[PDB]
Design a protein around this ligand. Structure first.
Ligand SMILES: Nc1ncnc2c1ncn2[C@@H]1O[C@H](COP(=O)(O)OP(=O)(O)NP(=O)(O)O)[C@@H](O)[C@H]1O
Ligand SMILES: Nc1ncnc2c1ncn2[C@@H]1O[C@H](COP(=O)(O)OP(=O)(O)NP(=O)(O)O)[C@@H](O)[C@H]1O
Ligand SMILES: Nc1c(C(=O)N[C@@H](CC(=O)O)C(=O)O)ncn1[C@@H]1O[C@H](COP(=O)(O)O)[C@@H](O)[C@H]1O
Ligand SMILES: Nc1c(C(=O)N[C@@H](CC(=O)O)C(=O)O)ncn1[C@@H]1O[C@H](COP(=O)(O)O)[C@@H](O)[C@H]1O
Ligand SMILES: [Mg+2]
Ligand SMILES: [Mg+2]
Ligand SMILES: [Mg+2]
Ligand SMILES: [Mg+2]
Lengths: 419, 419, 212
C-alpha cells in the first residue's frame, strides 16, 4: 500500500494521497472524541476502530442500496479508501423527531414533535460562528464551485432530496434492532474524477441520534458525551460502552431479516424472453427468481403440484403468471394459493387490447392483480417484499431518488439547448 | 353452570350434558397420559390443564381463521364447552415429513422425505386391530350415517381437503416459534344441531409431532413418552417439561408478529361507496383500513404530505388508489413511495373500457398494480400481508377451503334437480 | 387384462378363466383355449373404423387457400379425409346449396368448415340450410379481425353455427365431434392429451436445470 503526502488533518481524521491509485485517498481515523468549539476534547482508546467500522458498514449498506457514495473499501481496523472529493462546506441535517437545536431555534415546539416528511436543514461550516443555519437561497447565492461544478438550484435540490432518502434508508435499517434514528448530519462532495455530487466524509456515532426503544435516556450516540456537565474518567467509560454497543450491532444492518422469492410460471416456452426480463429485473432488487413451465389449460394437475412445492418449504413467495391469449394460469393460481399472484401477460399491439381482459375481469373470491410491464411486475414484487425486507426497501427508496436525479439532469441538459 | 348426566368417558376426557344449553356439552380433561393399545398409562398432575389450554388456544385460532370447529369457549383450567357432535370414527392424518407409521408401511422411504402437498391418510378407529389404514373407497362403502348425514363421496372429499387446510394453518402458525409441525391427527363429527361436518375432539400435544429447529431429538410432543424404553419417575418429569414447553408457547400462536394497514386514497367523496366496500372487506381479514380524500390533479402537494404521514410511522402499509376517469393518483403515488400501490378504479359500463387504460399503461419505473374488484383489492392487500402475518395468511387459507366446500354443496344441491 | 362380454364376469374371456380352475383337467384347458381363441378372433376388429368421417372446407375465395391447407393438413393428423371446395354465399348462393346437397346426400357423416374473410355469410347460410354441424373458421388478421369476427358470432335465432379461430383448432374440434362415434379418432385425441402433457413435464424439467 503506497502512502503519499498527508493532504490535511482535522480533529478525528488524517487524509493521505495514494500514489498507486489516481483520484483516491486514505482516511485514517484517530482515537480522539470532541464536541462544541471550546475545550471539550479527549483521548478515547478504540474510538478510531469503532468510527471506521460504523462508517465502513453504513457506506457499504448505502452503496449496495444504490446511493452514490465516496467509499471504495475498508483498509484495516482504523482506515478506509475513498474517492477524493472537493467537500461542499455544508452540514445537511435530517430530522424525524424534534430535539436538540430544532427546539432552541423554534421555542414552543415540544421534544417528540414528528416530521412527516422528515425535515431537511442546512448549516454553513464555520467554527467562528458555531455553524449558522443557511437557507437554500443563501447556498445558491454563494455561487460555490468545487472540482469545476457550480453549486446551483439543481445541485442544492439534489443534495436536499438525497439527504431525506439517506435518512429514510438508515431509519428503516435500524428499526429491526428496535432503535429509533431521531436525526443525522451528512456532508457531500464533488468526486474529482467523475464530477458527481456524492455522500462523503463519514457517517459514524457522532453523525446521528440513536434511541433504543425510542427512549432518549438510553441514547447510544455522541449526545451522551455532549450532555455530561463535567467529563470524568467514569463519564468517558460510559460514552465508550455506548460507542461499543453501536459497533457490536451495526454489521447486522447488512443482513436480510426475511427470505424473498419470485416464481414466474409461463404457459409456453415461446414467452421465455418476456420471463427472462422479469428474472433480470428481480436480480436488480437482490430477489431470487425461478422460471417454471406449466399450463392451466393442458396440465392443471401439474400447475397445482408445482404451486404446492413453493407453498410448502416456508419461503415467502410471489407468483408471477405469464400466459398469452386467454390467461387461465393467473386466475387458477390465484384461486388456489394464499400467496399473492401477479398476471404479467406478454401483450403485443396485435391482440393485446382483447387478451388483457382475461387477466382483469375475474369471478368473485380472486385477488389476482395485473401489471403489464415485465420490469414493473418485478418492481411490484420487490415493493411487496419491501414491507418485510429493509435491504429490498432501500433499493426501491434509492431508485426513486436516482430516477428523480436523472430527470433533473435531463432537464438541465435540454435547458442549455433553449438559448 | 348446570351440569347434567355423564354421557361418555374415555382414557383422557369425560363428556357431560348441559341442562340449560341445548346441543352443547362440557368436555372435562383428566390427569391421565396413555400410549398405544397396551399398558402404557400414567397419572400426570397438570396434564388435564395443559391439554385443555392447548386445544382451547388451537380451536380459537382455527375458529378465528374461519375453520368450522366444535368449540364454544374455555370453561376453567381443565374443561371446555363444545357443540355436541356424532363423531365419525376415522383418524385423519396429515404429513409434511415422512416418519412413524409412514416409514413402516412404505419400507425404502427415508425419514425426512417431504410431501408437496401434505399427505392425507385415513385410519379406522378400532384398538383391537391397532387402527388399520382405510382407503377413501372403504369409507364411502361403509355407508356411515351420523346425526342423519350419510357420509358419501362429497363428505369424504370435504374432510380430506379440510385436514390439509387445518394442517397448513397450524404449520404456518408454529413457524414463527422456530418449530416444525411434522404431522398431526384430527377427528371430525356431525354437529347434532346444524348437521355440518366440523373439526371436533381435541388438538393437543398428543395430536401432532413438534420439532424445534426441525430437530427430532428436541421433540416436544407425546412421542417423547411413546419412545421411553421403560417409564421411570425421572422419565415422566422430562415428558411433563416437554408438555409445559408447548403449554407456554401455544398462546403466542394467537398473537400477530407484524402490523398491517391499508390506506384507501380517493380523488372524490362521490367514490365513498366504493371505498366503504374496500374497508369492509379489509375488516374481514382483521387489517385496519383508513379512508383519506386527496386529488393528484388538484392537490398533488397534499397527496405527497398524506403519503409521508403513512410512510413515516413505522407501520407496513399498502395504498389503494380510487380515482374515476383519468387515474393520476395511482401513478403519482406509485412513483413517490417504496410501498405497494393498487389502483382500484370505480369503473361503470358507461366509460370503464376507456378509463381502465389510465391505470394499466404507465411510464417505465412504476410498479403500480391494477385490481378492478373492490373486495378483490382488499384480498390482494391481505395476500401481501399474509407473507408476514400468519393470522392474515390463515384467514386466506381457510377462505380457499370454505369457498371450495360451498361449490361442493351447491353441486350436491343442483344434482338432486337432475334425477 | 380382464375382459367381460356384456359386463358379465361369468363370460370372462381372459386368463382369469385359467387362474380360477380348482384343478387343471384336459377338458379345463380346452375351455381356456376357446376363450383365448375368442379374443384372438375379435382383437383385429379393434383396428377397424366402425363409422365414416369427412370434413368439407368451403372457402369464399382461393386467396384463403393457405388457411384451408392448414385445416386439411391437421385433419390428416386425425385420419379424417378432408375436401376443399370454392363457393361464395354472396355471389353464388344457388351453387353453395347444390355443393351442400352433394355432401348431405351420399350417406357419409360430414362436418362443414366455413372459411370466409370480412362479412362471413357462408357460415350462417350453410348453418341455416343443413342439419350437419357448421364451424366458421374465419381467416382473421390483426388489421380488421376484431371487426370481422362478429359476423361469425352474432347470428339470428335458429342457427347453431359455432366459431373456432384456430385452423388446427377447427380440425381438432371436427375430430372431437367424430370421436363420439369413431374409437380411432377418439384414441388419437386421447393420446395427444397425454403427449402434450408429457412435453410440458419435459420442458419444465429442462428449464429447472437453468435455475440452480
Ligand atoms: N472523500 C473525501 N475526499 C477528500 N476529503 C475528504 C473526504 N472525506 C472527508 N474529507 C475531508 O477530510 C477532512 C479531515 O476530516 P476531520 O478530521 O473529521 O475534519 P474536521 O476537523 O471534522 N474538519 P471539518 O469537517 O472541515 O469541520 C475534512 O475536512 C473533510 O472535508
Ligand atoms: N364435540 C364432541 N361432542 C361429543 N362427543 C365428543 C366431542 N368431542 C369428543 N367427543 C367424544 O368424547 C369421548 C371421550 O374422549 P376420550 O376420553 O379422549 O376418549 P378415547 O378414550 O380417546 N376414545 P376414542 O376417541 O373413541 O378412541 C370420545 O369418544 C369422543 O368421540
Ligand atoms: N454531529 C453533528 C454536528 C457536528 O458538528 N458535530 C460535532 C463536531 C464534530 O463532529 O467535530 C460536535 O460538535 O458534536 N452538527 C450536527 N450534528 C448531528 O446532527 C443532528 C442534529 O443535531 P442539532 O442540530 O440538533 O445539534 C444530530 O444527529 C447531531 O449529531
Ligand atoms: N396421536 C396419534 C394417534 C393416536 O391414536 N394417539 C394416541 C391414542 C391415544 O390417545 O391413546 C396414542 O396412542 O399415542 N394416531 C395418530 N396420531 C398422530 O398423528 C400423526 C400420525 O402418526 P403415525 O401414524 O405416524 O404414528 C402423529 O402426529 C401422531 O401423533
Ligand atoms: Mg453542526
Ligand atoms: Mg468532520
Ligand atoms: Mg392412531
Ligand atoms: Mg381421544
Amino acid at each position: 500500500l503506497n502512502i503519499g503526502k498527508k493532504l490535511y488533518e482535522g480533529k478525528t481524521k488524517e487524509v493521505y494521497e495514494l500514489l498507486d491509485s489516481p483520484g483516491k485517498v486514505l482516511l485514517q481515523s484517530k482515537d480522539q472524541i470532541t464536541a462544541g468549539n471550546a475545550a471539550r476534547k479527549n483521548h478515547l482508546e478504540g474510538k478510531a476502530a469503532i468510527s471506521n467500522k460504523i462508517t465502513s458498514c453504513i457506506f457499504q449498506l448505502l452503496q449496495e442500496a444504490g446511493i452514490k457514495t465516496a467509499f471504495t473499501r475498508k483498509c484495516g481496523e482504523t482506515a478506509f479508501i475513498a474517492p477524493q472529493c472537493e467537500m461542499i462546506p455544508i452540514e445537511w441535517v435530517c430530522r424525524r423527531i424534534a430535539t436538540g437545536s430544532f427546539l432552541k431555534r423554534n421555542p414552543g415546539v415540544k421534544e417528540g414533535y414528528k416530521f412527516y416528511p422528515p425535515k431537511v436543514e442546512l448549516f454553513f461550516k464555520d467554527d467562528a460562528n458555531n455553524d449558522p443555519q443557511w437557507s437554500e437561497e443563501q447556498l445558491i447565492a454563494a455561487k460555490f464551485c468545487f472540482a469545476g461544478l457550480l453549486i446551483g438550484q439543481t445541485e442544492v435540490d439534489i443534495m436536499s432530496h438525497a439527504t431525506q432518502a439517506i435518512f429514510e434508508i438508515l431509519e428503516k435499517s435500524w428499526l429491526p434492532q428496535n432503535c429509533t434514528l431521531v436525526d443525522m448530519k451528512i456532508e457531500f462532495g464533488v468526486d474529482v474524477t467523475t464530477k458527481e455530487i456524492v455522500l462523503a466524509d463519514v457517517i459514524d456515532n457522532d453523525s446521528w441520534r440513536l434511541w433504543p426503544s425510542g427512549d432518549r435516556s438510553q441514547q447510544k450516540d455522541k449526545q451522551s458525551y455532549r450532555d455530561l456537565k463535567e467529563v470524568t474518567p467514569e463519564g468517558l467509560q460510559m460514552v465508550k460502552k455506548n460507542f461499543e454497543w453501536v459497533a457490536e450491532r451495526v454489521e447486522l444492518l447488512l443482513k436480510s431479516e426475511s427470505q424473498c422469492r419470485v416464481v414466474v410460471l409461463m404457459g409456453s416456452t415461446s414467452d421465455l424472453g418476456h420471463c427472462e426480463k422479469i428474472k433480470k429485473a428481480c436480480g436488480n432488487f437482490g430477489i431470487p427468481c425461478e422460471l417454471r413451465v406449466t399450463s392451466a389449460h393442458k396440465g392443471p394437475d401439474e400447475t397445482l403440484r408445482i404451486k404446492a412445492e413453493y407453498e410448502g418449504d416456508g419461503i415467502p413467495t410471489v407468483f408471477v403468471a405469464v400466459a398469452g391469449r386467454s390467461n387461465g394460469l393467473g386466475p387458477v393460481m390465484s384461486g388456489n394459493t394464499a400467496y399473492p399472484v401477479i398476471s404479467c401477460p406478454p401483450l403485443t399491439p396485435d391482440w393485446g387490447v382483447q387478451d388483457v381482459w382475461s387477466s382483469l375481469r375475474l369471478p368473485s373470491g380472486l385477488g389476482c392483480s395485473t401489471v403489464l410491464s415485465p420490469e414493473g411486475s418485478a418492481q411490484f414484487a420487490a415493493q411487496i417484499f419491501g414491507l418485510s425486507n429493509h435491504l429490498v426497501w432501500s433499493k426501491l427508496r434509492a431508485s426513486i431518488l436516482n430516477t428523480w436525479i436523472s430527470l433533473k439532469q435531463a432537464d438541465k441538459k435540454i435547458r442549455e439547448c433553449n438559448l
